[PDB]
Amino acid sequence: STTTNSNSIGRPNLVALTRATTKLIYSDIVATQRTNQPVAAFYGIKYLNPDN
Amino acid sequence: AEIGGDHGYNATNIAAGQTSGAVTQIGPAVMGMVRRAIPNLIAFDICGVQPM
C-alpha cells in the first residue's frame, strides 16, 4: 500500500497574488490644474454692493 | 468709483503685487536677464607651447 506520504510534493503552485491598495480618491475630491511655475496664484474676484 | 491705485514705489510691494486701490497685480513682467561678460584670454603663443 504505497500511500501518498511516500511521494514528496515539489514546488507549490502560486495560485494568486494579493496586494492592498486603498480606493485612492484625490482626482474626484478636489479640482486640479497644473502649474507652470514654482509659485501658483489663484485670483479672487468679487462683486460688491455700495456697502462693500 | 473704483480707482486703479498704485504700488507705493516700495520694492517689497511691487514684487509681491500689493496695491493700494483695486485689482491686485498678478506680478511684474520679465524684461530680460543680464549676466557678466566672459573675460578674454591673452594668447598663449607668446610663451612656449609644447603639448605634453
Short mmCIF file of N, CA and C in Angstrom, two decimals:
data_model
loop_
_atom_site.label_atom_id
_atom_site.label_comp_id
_atom_site.label_asym_id
_atom_site.label_seq_id
_atom_site.Cartn_x
_atom_site.Cartn_y
_atom_site.Cartn_z
N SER A 1 0.83 -1.20 0.00
CA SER A 1 0.00 0.00 0.00
C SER A 1 0.86 1.25 0.00
N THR A 2 1.37 1.62 -1.17
CA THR A 2 2.21 2.81 -1.28
C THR A 2 1.35 4.06 -1.18
N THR A 3 1.22 4.59 0.03
CA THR A 3 0.37 5.75 0.27
C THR A 3 0.99 7.00 -0.35
N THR A 4 0.25 8.11 -0.27
CA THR A 4 0.75 9.37 -0.80
C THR A 4 1.83 9.99 0.08
N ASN A 5 2.01 9.51 1.31
CA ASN A 5 3.07 10.04 2.15
C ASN A 5 4.45 9.67 1.64
N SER A 6 4.55 8.65 0.79
CA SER A 6 5.83 8.34 0.16
C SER A 6 6.22 9.41 -0.85
N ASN A 7 5.25 9.89 -1.63
CA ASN A 7 5.51 10.97 -2.56
C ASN A 7 5.87 12.25 -1.81
N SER A 8 6.76 13.04 -2.40
CA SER A 8 7.15 14.33 -1.85
C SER A 8 6.72 15.42 -2.82
N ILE A 9 5.96 16.39 -2.31
CA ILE A 9 5.46 17.46 -3.16
C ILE A 9 6.61 18.37 -3.57
N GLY A 10 6.51 18.94 -4.76
CA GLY A 10 7.56 19.79 -5.28
C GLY A 10 7.29 21.26 -5.02
N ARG A 11 7.41 22.07 -6.06
CA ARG A 11 7.15 23.49 -5.92
C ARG A 11 5.66 23.72 -5.76
N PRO A 12 5.20 24.31 -4.66
CA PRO A 12 3.77 24.63 -4.54
C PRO A 12 3.36 25.63 -5.61
N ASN A 13 2.12 25.50 -6.07
CA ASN A 13 1.63 26.34 -7.15
C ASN A 13 1.19 27.70 -6.61
N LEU A 14 1.71 28.76 -7.21
CA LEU A 14 1.35 30.13 -6.84
C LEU A 14 0.03 30.48 -7.52
N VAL A 15 -1.06 30.26 -6.79
CA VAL A 15 -2.39 30.39 -7.40
C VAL A 15 -2.72 31.86 -7.67
N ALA A 16 -2.45 32.74 -6.70
CA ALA A 16 -2.89 34.11 -6.86
C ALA A 16 -2.09 35.05 -5.97
N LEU A 17 -1.81 36.24 -6.49
CA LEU A 17 -1.21 37.32 -5.72
C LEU A 17 -2.29 38.08 -4.95
N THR A 18 -1.85 38.96 -4.06
CA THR A 18 -2.78 39.77 -3.27
C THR A 18 -2.05 41.01 -2.78
N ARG A 19 -2.41 42.16 -3.32
CA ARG A 19 -1.86 43.44 -2.89
C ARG A 19 -2.97 44.28 -2.27
N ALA A 20 -2.57 45.18 -1.37
CA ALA A 20 -3.53 46.02 -0.66
C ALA A 20 -3.32 47.47 -1.06
N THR A 21 -4.36 48.08 -1.61
CA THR A 21 -4.33 49.48 -2.00
C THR A 21 -5.70 50.08 -1.74
N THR A 22 -5.73 51.27 -1.15
CA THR A 22 -6.99 51.95 -0.93
C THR A 22 -7.61 52.38 -2.26
N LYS A 23 -8.92 52.61 -2.24
CA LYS A 23 -9.56 53.21 -3.40
C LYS A 23 -9.17 54.68 -3.43
N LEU A 24 -8.01 54.98 -4.00
CA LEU A 24 -7.42 56.31 -3.87
C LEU A 24 -8.34 57.34 -4.51
N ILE A 25 -8.81 58.28 -3.70
CA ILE A 25 -9.74 59.31 -4.13
C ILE A 25 -9.08 60.66 -3.88
N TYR A 26 -8.37 61.16 -4.88
CA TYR A 26 -7.94 62.55 -4.86
C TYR A 26 -8.17 63.24 -6.19
N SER A 27 -8.44 62.51 -7.27
CA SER A 27 -8.79 63.13 -8.53
C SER A 27 -10.23 63.62 -8.53
N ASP A 28 -11.11 62.97 -7.77
CA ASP A 28 -12.53 63.30 -7.78
C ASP A 28 -12.94 64.21 -6.63
N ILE A 29 -12.12 64.33 -5.59
CA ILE A 29 -12.50 65.15 -4.45
C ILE A 29 -12.16 66.61 -4.70
N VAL A 30 -11.05 66.88 -5.37
CA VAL A 30 -10.53 68.24 -5.49
C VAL A 30 -10.29 68.58 -6.95
N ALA A 31 -10.39 69.87 -7.26
CA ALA A 31 -10.17 70.38 -8.60
C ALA A 31 -8.68 70.59 -8.84
N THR A 32 -8.19 70.12 -9.98
CA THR A 32 -6.77 70.12 -10.28
C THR A 32 -6.50 70.88 -11.57
N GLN A 33 -5.46 71.71 -11.55
CA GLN A 33 -4.95 72.34 -12.75
C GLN A 33 -3.45 72.51 -12.58
N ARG A 34 -2.68 72.01 -13.53
CA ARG A 34 -1.23 72.01 -13.39
C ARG A 34 -0.68 73.43 -13.43
N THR A 35 0.39 73.64 -12.66
CA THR A 35 1.03 74.94 -12.56
C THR A 35 2.39 74.90 -13.23
N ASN A 36 2.72 75.96 -13.96
CA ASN A 36 3.94 76.01 -14.75
C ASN A 36 5.08 76.76 -14.07
N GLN A 37 4.89 77.20 -12.84
CA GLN A 37 5.93 77.94 -12.14
C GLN A 37 5.91 77.59 -10.66
N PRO A 38 7.06 77.70 -9.98
CA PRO A 38 7.15 77.24 -8.59
C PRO A 38 6.25 77.98 -7.62
N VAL A 39 5.55 79.00 -8.08
CA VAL A 39 4.54 79.69 -7.28
C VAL A 39 3.27 79.79 -8.10
N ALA A 40 2.16 79.36 -7.52
CA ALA A 40 0.85 79.40 -8.16
C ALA A 40 0.00 80.49 -7.52
N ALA A 41 -0.69 81.26 -8.35
CA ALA A 41 -1.53 82.36 -7.88
C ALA A 41 -2.95 82.16 -8.38
N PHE A 42 -3.89 82.04 -7.46
CA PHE A 42 -5.30 81.91 -7.80
C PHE A 42 -6.00 83.24 -7.57
N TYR A 43 -6.67 83.74 -8.60
CA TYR A 43 -7.34 85.02 -8.50
C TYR A 43 -8.66 84.89 -7.74
N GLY A 44 -8.94 85.89 -6.93
CA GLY A 44 -10.25 86.01 -6.31
C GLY A 44 -10.87 87.34 -6.68
N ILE A 45 -11.94 87.30 -7.46
CA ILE A 45 -12.58 88.50 -7.98
C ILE A 45 -14.03 88.50 -7.51
N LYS A 46 -14.45 89.60 -6.91
CA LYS A 46 -15.75 89.68 -6.26
C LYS A 46 -16.52 90.89 -6.75
N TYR A 47 -17.84 90.82 -6.63
CA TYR A 47 -18.74 91.92 -6.96
C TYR A 47 -19.39 92.40 -5.68
N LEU A 48 -19.33 93.70 -5.43
CA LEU A 48 -19.70 94.25 -4.14
C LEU A 48 -20.88 95.21 -4.26
N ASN A 49 -21.59 95.36 -3.15
CA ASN A 49 -22.61 96.38 -3.01
C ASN A 49 -21.96 97.72 -2.74
N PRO A 50 -22.70 98.82 -2.88
CA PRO A 50 -22.16 100.13 -2.47
C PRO A 50 -21.82 100.19 -0.99
N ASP A 51 -22.08 99.11 -0.25
CA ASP A 51 -21.62 98.97 1.13
C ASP A 51 -20.54 97.91 1.26
N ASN A 52 -19.90 97.54 0.15
CA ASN A 52 -18.75 96.63 0.07
C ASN A 52 -19.08 95.19 0.43
N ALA B 1 -15.60 105.24 -7.05
CA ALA B 1 -15.91 104.72 -8.38
C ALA B 1 -14.81 103.80 -8.89
N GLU B 2 -14.19 103.07 -7.96
CA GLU B 2 -13.20 102.04 -8.27
C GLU B 2 -11.99 102.62 -9.01
N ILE B 3 -11.22 103.43 -8.28
CA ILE B 3 -9.95 103.90 -8.82
C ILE B 3 -9.00 102.72 -8.98
N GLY B 4 -7.97 102.94 -9.79
CA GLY B 4 -6.97 101.91 -10.03
C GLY B 4 -5.98 101.76 -8.91
N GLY B 5 -5.48 102.87 -8.38
CA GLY B 5 -4.49 102.82 -7.33
C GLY B 5 -3.13 102.41 -7.86
N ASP B 6 -2.11 102.46 -7.01
CA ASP B 6 -0.76 102.11 -7.44
C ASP B 6 0.04 101.60 -6.25
N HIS B 7 1.10 100.87 -6.55
CA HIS B 7 2.05 100.48 -5.52
C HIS B 7 2.78 101.72 -5.00
N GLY B 8 3.19 101.66 -3.74
CA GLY B 8 3.84 102.80 -3.12
C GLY B 8 5.27 103.00 -3.55
N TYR B 9 5.64 102.45 -4.71
CA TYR B 9 7.01 102.53 -5.22
C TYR B 9 7.99 101.93 -4.22
N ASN B 10 7.52 100.94 -3.47
CA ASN B 10 8.30 100.28 -2.43
C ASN B 10 8.56 98.85 -2.88
N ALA B 11 9.81 98.56 -3.24
CA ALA B 11 10.22 97.33 -3.91
C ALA B 11 9.53 96.08 -3.37
N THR B 12 9.34 96.02 -2.05
CA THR B 12 8.69 94.86 -1.46
C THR B 12 7.27 94.69 -1.99
N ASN B 13 6.52 95.79 -2.08
CA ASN B 13 5.13 95.69 -2.52
C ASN B 13 5.04 95.37 -4.00
N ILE B 14 5.86 96.02 -4.83
CA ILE B 14 5.75 95.86 -6.27
C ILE B 14 6.09 94.45 -6.72
N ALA B 15 7.06 93.81 -6.07
CA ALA B 15 7.38 92.43 -6.41
C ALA B 15 6.23 91.50 -6.05
N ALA B 16 5.63 91.69 -4.88
CA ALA B 16 4.50 90.86 -4.48
C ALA B 16 3.23 91.23 -5.23
N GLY B 17 3.12 92.49 -5.65
CA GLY B 17 1.93 92.97 -6.32
C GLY B 17 0.94 93.67 -5.41
N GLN B 18 1.27 93.84 -4.13
CA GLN B 18 0.43 94.58 -3.20
C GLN B 18 0.15 95.98 -3.73
N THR B 19 -1.12 96.32 -3.89
CA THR B 19 -1.50 97.60 -4.44
C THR B 19 -2.28 98.39 -3.40
N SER B 20 -2.75 99.57 -3.79
CA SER B 20 -3.44 100.47 -2.88
C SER B 20 -4.91 100.66 -3.21
N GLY B 21 -5.29 100.55 -4.48
CA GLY B 21 -6.68 100.73 -4.87
C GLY B 21 -7.41 99.41 -5.00
N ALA B 22 -7.66 99.00 -6.24
CA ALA B 22 -8.32 97.74 -6.52
C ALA B 22 -7.50 96.95 -7.53
N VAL B 23 -7.86 95.67 -7.67
CA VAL B 23 -7.23 94.77 -8.63
C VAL B 23 -5.74 94.63 -8.33
N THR B 24 -5.40 93.75 -7.39
CA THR B 24 -4.00 93.44 -7.14
C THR B 24 -3.35 92.88 -8.39
N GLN B 25 -2.15 93.36 -8.69
CA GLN B 25 -1.44 92.91 -9.87
C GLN B 25 -1.04 91.44 -9.74
N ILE B 26 -1.13 90.72 -10.85
CA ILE B 26 -0.64 89.35 -10.89
C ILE B 26 0.82 89.30 -10.48
N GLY B 27 1.62 90.19 -11.05
CA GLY B 27 3.03 90.27 -10.74
C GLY B 27 3.75 91.08 -11.79
N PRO B 28 5.06 91.25 -11.61
CA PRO B 28 5.84 92.01 -12.58
C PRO B 28 5.98 91.26 -13.89
N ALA B 29 6.57 91.95 -14.86
CA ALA B 29 6.90 91.35 -16.14
C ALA B 29 8.32 90.77 -16.06
N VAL B 30 8.85 90.35 -17.20
CA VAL B 30 10.23 89.86 -17.29
C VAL B 30 10.86 90.55 -18.49
N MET B 31 11.55 91.66 -18.24
CA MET B 31 12.15 92.42 -19.33
C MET B 31 13.42 91.78 -19.86
N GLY B 32 14.05 90.89 -19.11
CA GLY B 32 15.25 90.21 -19.55
C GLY B 32 16.20 89.96 -18.41
N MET B 33 17.30 89.29 -18.73
CA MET B 33 18.32 88.92 -17.77
C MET B 33 19.68 89.40 -18.25
N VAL B 34 20.49 89.92 -17.33
CA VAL B 34 21.81 90.44 -17.64
C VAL B 34 22.84 89.67 -16.82
N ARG B 35 23.88 89.18 -17.49
CA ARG B 35 24.96 88.46 -16.83
C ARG B 35 26.29 89.09 -17.22
N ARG B 36 27.28 88.90 -16.36
CA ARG B 36 28.59 89.50 -16.59
C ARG B 36 29.25 88.88 -17.82
N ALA B 37 30.09 89.68 -18.47
CA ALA B 37 30.75 89.25 -19.69
C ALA B 37 31.86 88.25 -19.38
N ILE B 38 32.24 87.48 -20.40
CA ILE B 38 33.31 86.49 -20.28
C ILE B 38 34.63 87.20 -20.57
N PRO B 39 35.58 87.22 -19.64
CA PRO B 39 36.85 87.89 -19.91
C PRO B 39 37.60 87.21 -21.05
N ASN B 40 38.40 87.99 -21.76
CA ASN B 40 39.17 87.46 -22.87
C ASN B 40 40.47 86.84 -22.37
N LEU B 41 41.16 86.15 -23.28
CA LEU B 41 42.37 85.41 -22.95
C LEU B 41 43.57 86.00 -23.66
N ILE B 42 44.66 86.16 -22.92
CA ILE B 42 45.94 86.55 -23.51
C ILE B 42 46.49 85.34 -24.25
N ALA B 43 46.86 85.53 -25.51
CA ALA B 43 47.27 84.42 -26.36
C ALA B 43 48.45 83.68 -25.76
N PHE B 44 48.35 82.35 -25.71
CA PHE B 44 49.41 81.54 -25.13
C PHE B 44 50.65 81.48 -26.01
N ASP B 45 50.52 81.80 -27.30
CA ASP B 45 51.64 81.61 -28.21
C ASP B 45 52.81 82.53 -27.92
N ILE B 46 52.64 83.54 -27.07
CA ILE B 46 53.77 84.38 -26.68
C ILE B 46 54.81 83.55 -25.94
N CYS B 47 54.37 82.63 -25.10
CA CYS B 47 55.26 81.71 -24.43
C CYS B 47 55.33 80.39 -25.19
N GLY B 48 56.18 79.49 -24.72
CA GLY B 48 56.33 78.19 -25.34
C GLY B 48 55.07 77.35 -25.28
N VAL B 49 54.70 76.74 -26.40
CA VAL B 49 53.56 75.83 -26.48
C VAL B 49 54.09 74.46 -26.86
N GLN B 50 54.19 73.57 -25.87
CA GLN B 50 54.68 72.21 -26.08
C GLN B 50 53.69 71.24 -25.47
N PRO B 51 52.74 70.73 -26.25
CA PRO B 51 51.78 69.76 -25.72
C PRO B 51 52.48 68.51 -25.23
N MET B 52 52.33 68.23 -23.94
CA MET B 52 52.91 67.03 -23.35
C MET B 52 52.00 65.83 -23.55
#
